[PDB]
Design a protein around this ligand. Structure first.
Ligand code: MED
Ligand code: NA
Lengths: 130, 132
């Protein structure tokens, strides 16, 4: 198993972020060895990586906290977990759709520079009139 | 002409957000009337709308300020403006692709629940009624 410094280097998540994840219930409680120190197993690293990934994708701490809490309650929460993730999925896909509309807008503007504005050496206003 | 209240309503952007965009150079300076109040035209609204959409997509405030600055400088900056947009495009595409990775991960986990874990639980409940 890994100590926290090793877990940080492996996950690309800072040691203090890992401490925070555990304290507020984003990742399961971590084993403490005889000397009082955290020792991280494979499933701990998987929770760390999942948290890092979902947070960077915009899922809130509060949803992720709820999901781990249901997970720790065991099999009687399977249906509530599938539902929670399905709600997060729709929200995420909506965020993706928003971002893609902006990328499409940027692509249109860039095509306009490449195809029209730069060859004419004209601003869009200029060019539109002609 | 629109006033700021009209421009805020039409653009879906708060009046204080509009004032902030002008103040820091995200949108071009707005014409003032004889009273000193702002009067908005169509290109103003087009800039407010572009700014809002781009900021919401995470384009940096500093990139958008540079883009307007180039625009205001004139025709000689056209190539530099396309390069700026192209750089922002790459970075936005990368952000989207990372979000899509996360979505694929949620779908995988959701398929495991709906395909495997829940019907497994359901099958056991049936076994237990049809054995009782
Ligand atoms: C470390 S996240 C694992 C997610 C798990 N609860 C599942 O059933 O797919
Ligand atoms: Na070890």
């Amino acid at each position: 198993s890994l100590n926290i410094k090793e877990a940080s280097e492996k996950s690309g998540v800072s040691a203090d972020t890992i401490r925070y994840y555990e304290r507020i219930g984003l990742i399961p409680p971590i084993h403490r060895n005889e000397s009082g120190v955290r020792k991280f197993g494979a499933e701990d690293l998987r929770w760390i990586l999942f948290t890092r990934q979902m947070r960077r994708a915009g899922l809130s701490i509060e949803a992720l906290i709820d999901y781990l809490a249901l997970f720790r309650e065991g099999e009687h929460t399977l249906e509530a977990r599938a539902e929670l993730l399905k709600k997060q999925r729709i929200e995420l896909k909506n965020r993706i759709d928003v971002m893609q509309e902006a990328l499409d807008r940027l692509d249109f503007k860039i095509d306009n520079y490449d195809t029209h504005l730069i060859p004419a050496q004209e601003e869009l206003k200029d060019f539109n009139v002609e």
